Design an enzyme around this catalytic site. Structure first.
Site, short mmCIF file in Angstrom:
data_model
loop_
_atom_site.label_atom_id
_atom_site.label_comp_id
_atom_site.label_asym_id
_atom_site.label_seq_id
_atom_site.Cartn_x
_atom_site.Cartn_y
_atom_site.Cartn_z
N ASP D 254 0.94 -1.08 0.12
CA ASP D 254 -0.17 -0.05 0.10
C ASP D 254 0.82 1.29 0.01
O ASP D 254 1.62 1.62 1.07
CB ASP D 254 -1.03 -0.10 1.23
CG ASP D 254 -0.35 -0.48 2.43
OD1 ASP D 254 0.33 -1.32 2.58
OD2 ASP D 254 -0.75 -0.10 3.55
N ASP D 286 -6.08 9.50 3.79
CA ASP D 286 -5.22 8.85 4.30
C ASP D 286 -4.18 8.56 3.45
O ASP D 286 -4.21 7.53 2.67
CB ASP D 286 -6.00 7.52 4.91
CG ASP D 286 -5.21 6.45 5.92
OD1 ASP D 286 -3.87 7.14 5.99
OD2 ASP D 286 -5.39 5.54 6.36
MG LIG Z 1 -7.14 4.11 6.17
MG LIG Z 2 -3.53 2.81 3.32
#
Ligand SMILES: [Mg+2]
Ligand SMILES: [Mg+2]
Ligand SMILES: [Mg+2]
Ligand SMILES: [Mg+2]
Ligand SMILES: [Mg+2]
Ligand SMILES: [Mg+2]
Ligand SMILES: [Mg+2]
Ligand SMILES: [Mg+2]
Lengths: 386, 386, 386, 386
Positions: D254, D286
């Site tokens: 990620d 985020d």
């Molecule tokens: Mg998140």
């Molecule tokens: Mg993430």
């Protein structure tokens, strides 16, 4: 019972069993290990040797006296155990100075520093007996398109590897380099992302004979590629100088599971290939005991790496030696695959009516390959279900 | 308004706009096109040329008289429109005889046939004016590990490409070969799965100068690789002989969306690179109008391929020419990346205290790369939000 | 020697062993099979039954008399062999009318037709004894964002499934539905792409008790998901009404390899779960013998599906029954995982100082999970290396 | 010029701009930020608010007096700027005690602690004005199959969420929960790996109305899924309580790139959907400014998140409002998709010969969907090339 001994050439990085368990979302779960204790514990498990990054063996920023003492203690541990150091490498990825790369950092001063840091450790590697010097350019690459002109970066990469070749030649060292591809992580995309890209790059170096690849199971699997196939191409090129063994479950962050975990059948076909081809280098594990584990679990996971290699070796050998498999291989024309297509030459092929004008394509098409029967024999051998 | 003309060198395979829409779970949704009608419609859209597999232009199994008539009609269409044929290729994948490969089929008789079929079409390609002959070995590979010894297969592959090189040389042809990698589909794993693997393989051919790569956008993206980076490595090697342009949404079956669809930012960086590097070959689309579309949608999708290339070309050029971007590139040290690391030489580097002993690693580490500002300028240019 | 019998409940789709081998780049490599011959050959291998799409059993567009004769011959084959038909389904994907979907086609007339086609086959399924009616909406989805408003499509999907529920209730049928998720292929993205999405959707149907899932090994693996975990969630929800078993090598086109091929360890953990949980439904194979194979290879591949299930069943049972494994499971606190967190209730938890104020987080953190030893016992059992 | 203001509801986690740059292979590249300075800098950029994990705002292990002072300073920063705190969450992943999970840890004492830690922070979240309480169970899952019985783990997960629901109800709080799926990382496989799995799980909770999802762009893309489609299903279920916006380049670790980076067209279709559907929650980022960046690059990257949202909002609105697009949507039958399939009811459908007996399937099949023209209008709008 699949017990490893030093003759099996199993090796481990200090940073493997020594991994403290920090991940992007988690603090350490284990204390740091003294390299001396890792050498001893690995020897007790039947390992042949260890490997190191510079900064695993000597803390970054150590004084000369501290350096000497770290090396002295490590040498004593090697001498106490009979362990070898067949490979070493440089850490060109942890320190924030390497945030845009070592050899291909946009900052020229960083590129020069990366080379000096590497050269210093080549000298130490040779002192400790290493035959191979690995380079994993984990910071070489980019997250965005404008940040890195890849042709320019490859020019810098070539310049760096050529200088390292010049250096080892100037010192009369026998050590050879092994470039480790990885597709991504920690950069969004890493330069030389696969075995193929690394092999291709080596061919443009000034002294290509000094460089091979150090492929890692999980790295090729992070691109969804077939690791045994990539190893076969490396062997075909004469460039499998070293290998990193571990496990990976598909396309995701690099997991570094113990060898045999992840894609079990790919591990089987890998061992089959390494053994059939007579690969003679270290069977090196670049893995991380999961951070769920304590100190005892670290050693269990390391032991499992070697155990799984040995089980797979047994099953692959049994597969290849089984007369029923040998018959199935002939039924699937693996023998034909190994015969030249046209040793008679181009003109003979052009003049051969059996190759076109009178070739019965329908009869050829109707011949089944019998690959499923062959593969189920392979499955039965792997599972001990013959 | 981003209107293509033949000067833009946009080309299309007959099999692209001619795709009838059969997929693994679906019957055809469109009738077959006469190549003559495709040549005319593509010319009307501003294309420069077309390309073909043998069996797209002449139905498989055609008599000599049928062959002559198919070629005569096609030649007339080229002459009626001014369209060119810069590239051709062989179909070594559709007929069931090729179920285990063409050049690397386990059956030797199939390998010989594949070579004869290819050679016949090289002659025709030259007659029709092609400069490049593509080879996509879509059936070369395996679903299971025992079925294909990859070293043996690479020996056969090399033997085949060497024979083709011998052939073109013997005929005095100027045509060059371009090997097209793909990681998988229709085989579980395809040999030469990426640009890197193909580049590496070429270096082992007898006459490597005759061979380059024909990378396809979606193919590298099927391995999660960065297509612009792979193109950069091909350019760095002097091997970008041709390219296949399309779109792909990540790691899955090959979608062959129109160019610009799929990964839009990767398309931007690709066009930026091709234009900056002065790539002079065809901008060839290997795409499929989705099977949802009728005849009108086919031509809309083809037009979109060219339109998107031209929009991206405009935006990339504007990005590179913007003095604010030029300043940002300097702020990110792209200029430094392009300067040699150590033109002073190895000994000078070793003797340079500024490269190690007196290198302030902390000061260097603290210098931000400014890549996010650079990338947001790139985004703003792409979106016309400056 | 792992010999299947009808008591093992192994079933196969007509379209599995009957797959002619057409893929996106290839023509058929095998002749079509008469369903009667498939029923006989599968029975001889020890299968329990078969399954069908409407259009596998009765050619699309058949007259009423042709339909009656196809069904009569099939019924006789079932009667001749003792084979059952536990599941059937509709082909809402092959015919070009379904190019944008069946139940979620943008064209309303197509949606209505899809429902009528399904209802007709539900009647036949019931006549032939099926307990489960599968729905795989392979054409429901999109290649582009504007083409499909997903909320509207889900409204249409719900409307369709609700009507089917109304229909079976109106006829007094006992048959239940099983929705089969798939993430992509043949659409760029398919609606209800995973087990989770299908489970969530079912909860919004008018009569959710009539609907469960039919997960397929390779489908979840096409999203890189853990198939055993998804099966566990389906079981947890009480919704595992049927399952499709096959193999898949990672994230790519759906391969439909025989069961046990692809991810072998995931197959082991799947069988462990199905057997431990007491799943009582068919062990149905939705696979394709690779197109490399002839008629003999088809039956070998089908036999291998069942053999691999039975080997894995044996090894998983041995793992769970081994007192050393039982001890390792306790060492890893699998027993604790199965005990309620706070059967004492919320207020007691809030008042429990051992849960926060006096919880020794460091002591808890130091406790290794012992998962690697457990997993190596699992590996040893799978490989018959205990 | 796409300038954000607080009315746009843009929010950021403290841990986003505050990310120090540690990754699995790298030490921090930036100093820690005081939350007070982040609140001020974000306000200056036009943010509406911030969010926090417990341990971002109050260092883990703080005394009561230290806690009070951290909160007091943060409250003053909110008051000085007008910033809001619409969401908070618990860190159940960093501390080594959570190495096997929080709510689904095998150790029962850890599960109880995780609940107490969460409850303490729910109280603080309410005090600071939060409407949503996110739960990202990043440690819930496994690397190996024997380590985690998923049915048992889901029982524990349900028990935990039910207790949290009981707690908020007992206190009369209005706060609602949002469960954040992720497929993997930091565990090999994470439980509730996608939006679908989380939606399905919520339906088994005692008070499902108290729980929704907090999907994250990059998380669904880590499974190769279509994020806009998943958001549509969440909206369809009435469960889009919050969202995490960022960028991701495909299937890999990620990346947490700024919003708009990664898959640009998916970002366009996401914004189109959120705006069309009238999503009224925070537009929360985020993300992680890449570790290549300094302090100035952090704020540039944060600014880019908001800028890209606003550009995409403009282009999507223009697309939907364009009469030519409205005509294309009708040509593609998007209007029909939104009409009921059979409001006439089941019996009427069964009796409707136009739906089967007299349905011209060939005429329907011949109708093109016109999706490519529609999608090229969408491309032209996105790129400002109309
Ligand atoms: Mg998140
Ligand atoms: Mg993430
Ligand atoms: Mg690794
Ligand atoms: Mg490695
Ligand atoms: Mg393609
Ligand atoms: Mg192509
Ligand atoms: Mg399938
Ligand atoms: Mg299926």
């Amino acid at each position: 019972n699949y017990q490893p001994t030093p003759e099996d050439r199993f090796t481990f990085g200090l940073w493997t069993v020594g991994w403290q368990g920090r991940d992007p979302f988690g603090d350490a779960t284990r204390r740091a290990l003294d390299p001396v204790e890792s050498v001893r514990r690995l020897a007790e498990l039947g390992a042949h040797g260890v490997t190191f990054h510079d900064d695993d063996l000597i803390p970054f920023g150590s004084s000369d006296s501290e350096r000497e003492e770290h090396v002295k203690r490590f040498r004593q541990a090697l001498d106490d155990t009979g362990m070898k150091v067949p490979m070493a490498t440089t850490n060109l990825f942890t320190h924030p100075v390497f945030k845009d790369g070592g050899f291909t950092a946009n900052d020229r001063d960083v590129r020069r520093y990366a080379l000096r840091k590497t050269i210093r450790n080549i000298d130490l590697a040779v002192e400790l007996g290493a035959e191979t010097y690995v380079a994993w350019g984990g910071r070489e690459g980019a997250e965005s398109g404008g940040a890195k002109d890849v042709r320019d970066a490859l020019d810098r990469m070539k310049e760096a590897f050529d200088l390292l070749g010049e250096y080892v030649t100037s010192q009369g060292y026998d050590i050879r380099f092994a470039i480790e591809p990885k597709p991504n992580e920690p950069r969004g995309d890493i330069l030389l992302p696969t075995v193929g890209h690394a092999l291709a790059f080596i061919e443009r170096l000034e002294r290509p004979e000094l460089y091979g690849v150090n492929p890692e199971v999980g790295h090729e699997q992070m691109a969804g590629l077939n690791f045994p196939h990539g190893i076969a191409q490396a062997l075909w090129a004469g460039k499998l100088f070293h290998i990193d063994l571990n496990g990976q479950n598909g396309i995701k962050y690099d997991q570094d599971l113990r060898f045999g975990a992840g894609d079990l059948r790919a591990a089987f076909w890998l061992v089959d290939l390494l053994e059939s081809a007579g690969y003679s280098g270290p069977r090196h594990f670049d893995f991380k005991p999961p951070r769920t584990e304590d100190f005892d679990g670290v050693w269990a996971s390391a032991a499992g790496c070697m155990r799984n290699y040995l089980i797979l070796k047994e099953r692959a050998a049994a597969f290849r030696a089984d007369p029923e498999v040998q018959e199935a291989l002939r039924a699937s024309r693996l023998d034909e695959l190994a015969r030249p297509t046209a040793a008679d030459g181009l003109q003979a092929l052009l003049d051969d009516r059996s190759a076109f004008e009178e070739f019965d394509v329908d009869a050829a098409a109707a011949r089944g390959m019998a690959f499923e029967r062959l593969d189920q024999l392979a499955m039965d051998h792997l599972l001990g279900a013959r």
